[PDB]
């Protein structure tokens, strides 16, 4: 007659010796699958193109967020360096005849 399905394969020791000798080949060569983690001027005319076009985009974001009733979807990434200057930190606050902080802005560890 005629069948209709290759049945359940019988696990002989011959199958496993074909299988565990595969695993030794992929461990010892260390080529195996795994779910790797996801990490994380130029020209005088081109920079002036870049500087115009970011001044226009920040004008656009101010308009579009006002349409959207401020509910703003944040920017994905942001990496920046900044430079702080040691001042006696009455001089970082607004013009007013008092103060709350007397020491310098740079920490003693940071100097």
């Amino acid at each position: 007659f005629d069948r209709t399905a290759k049945p359940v394969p019988v696990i002989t020791s011959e199958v496993t010796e074909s299988l565990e000798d595969m695993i030794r080949r992929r461990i010892q060569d260390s080529n195996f699958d795994d779910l790797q983690r996801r990490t994380l001027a130029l020209s005088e005319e081109l920079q002036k193109a870049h500087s115009e076009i970011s001044e226009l985009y920040a004008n656009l974001v101010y308009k579009l967020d006002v349409l959207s009733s401020v509910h703003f979807v944040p920017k994905p990434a942001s990496t920046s360096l900044e430079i702080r200057v040691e001042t006696p930190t009455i001089s970082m606050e607004d013009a007013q005849p008092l103060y709350m902080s007397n020491a310098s802005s740079l920490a003693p560890q940071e100097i």
Partner: protein, 182 residues
């Protein structure tokens, strides 16, 4: 004016009082009807923004293609213009000049969204329910018909609670509960 004759015609080949090239096909009226927007200057208050999308699209097209600014910068923008929901898909970068239309931004209006979510029957009738004060976004009810609604914020429009129009809905399913005083 008169359905002027054939010899009147050739001298007045160009005059027309209703339709001008300045007037630009009356596109501004033609989409004010389809979305039922209240004040006239509302169109060109969008069409200044919807033009300003394309002017930023154009100069960002004039940068060279393998520039990690330019590749970063419109995909930065299509994130926002899809979150706000003016454009259907995020894939094409040339939706940003071709699919950004006023009728795209004029259907994230609140009364259109109340007609999309099948709240009111028609689109004029949704303006009738907003102006009377039956609809709300989260805590506070909204009263300007022309409230833009973010695709994220599009989840949260409901009928305002204890209203006479959210009471009638619950009577149809025979599921009122006056401990809520619905």
């Amino acid at each position: 004016v008169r359905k002027l004759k054939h010899h009147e015609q050739k001298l007045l080949k160009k005059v027309d009082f209703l339709e001008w090239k300045q007037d630009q096909g009356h596109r501004d009226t033609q989409v004010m009807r389809t979305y039922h927007i209240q004040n006239r200057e509302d169109y060109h208050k969008y069409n200044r923004i919807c033009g300003d999308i394309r002017r930023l699209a154009n100069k960002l097209s004039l940068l060279p293609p393998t520039d990690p600014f330019r590749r970063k910068h419109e995909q930065l923008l299509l994130d926002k213009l899809y979150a706000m929901g003016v454009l259907t898909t995020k894939s094409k970068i040339s939706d940003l000049e071709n699919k950004v239309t006023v009728s795209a931004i004029c259907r994230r209006r609140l009364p259109v969204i109340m007609h999309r979510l099948k709240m009111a029957e028609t689109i004029q009738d949704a303006v009738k329910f907003i102006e009377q004060g039956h609809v709300r976004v989260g805590p506070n009810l909204i009263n300007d018909p022309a409230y833009l609604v973010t695709r994220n914020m599009e989840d949260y429009v409901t009928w305002v609670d204890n209203s006479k129009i959210k009471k009638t809905l619950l009577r149809y399913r025979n599921q009122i509960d006056d401990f809520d005083f619905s």
